[PDB]
Amino acid sequence: HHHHHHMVHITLDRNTANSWLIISKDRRQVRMGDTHQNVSDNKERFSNYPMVLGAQRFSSGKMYWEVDVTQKEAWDLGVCRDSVQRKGQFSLSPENGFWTIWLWQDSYEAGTSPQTTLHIQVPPCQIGIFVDYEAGVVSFYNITDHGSLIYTFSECVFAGPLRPFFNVGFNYSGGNAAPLKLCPL
Numbered sequence: 001h002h003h004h005h006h007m008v009h010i011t012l013d014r015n016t017a018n019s020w021l022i023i024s025k026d027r028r029q030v031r032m033g034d035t036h037q038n039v040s041d042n043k044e045r046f047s048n049y050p051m052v053l054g055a056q057r058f059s060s061g062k063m064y065w066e067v068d069v070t071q072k073e074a075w076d077l078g079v080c081r082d083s084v085q086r087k088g089q090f091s092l093s094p095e096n097g098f099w100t101i102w103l104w105q106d107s108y109e110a111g112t113s114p115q116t117t118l119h120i121q122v123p124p125c126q127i128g129i130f131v132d133y134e135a136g137v138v139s140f141y142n143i144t145d146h147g148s149l150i151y152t153f154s155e156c157v158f159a160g161p162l163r164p165f166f167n168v169g170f171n172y173s174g175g176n177a178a179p180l181k182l183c184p185l
């Protein structure tokens with residue numbers, strides 16, 4: 001892929017984070033804390049899951065960014081509508097305003113309804129995410145395997161501004177503490 005030149009500088013929006021997340025001072029890294037991080041509640045915070053949004057909102061154009069997932073057992077990455085549900089239980093699907101992929105229990109899947117099996121020969125340490133707003137496309141790339149395609153959502157109905165979407169995952173196992181990191185351009 002030759003999408004690298006649409007690179008955008010993503011930063012995390014504290015105010016949207018689940019109350020157990022710890023965001024770095026530069027707003028480029030996030031991890032699960034071992035307890036509530038002593039912040040007030042607000043209607044923006046994801047309540048049920050360890051999720052946070054990027055600060056940037058996209059309504060046009062082509063955008064590309066990279067995320068480091070080194071040594072994580074579980075995570076969700078992609079984009080979502082600015083108006084996604086924050087409170088209670090929900091599934092990651094385009095019907096709910098999410099265009100995402102994840103790792104869970106040693107398999108990779110795309111957030112369709114129902115979910116789609118991905119075929120990855122080289123477990124990724126970094127993921128590239130490409131959005132073409134006008135074309136209605138979200139694509140994922142394996143940076144570890146020379147940028148090979150993972151998955152393309154096409155005919156997307158965004159139906160509003162898009163925000164970068166992150167889930168660091170739970171850490172019941174003690175093996176999923178590692179952060180998500182936004183990689184430098």
Ligand SMILES: CC(=O)NCc1ccnc(N(C)C)c1
Nearest residue numbers: 018020047048049170171172
């Ligand atoms: C082991 C582990 O990852 N537990 C974290 C945890 C426990 C209970 N509720 C949580 N939230 C929904 C904020 C997070």
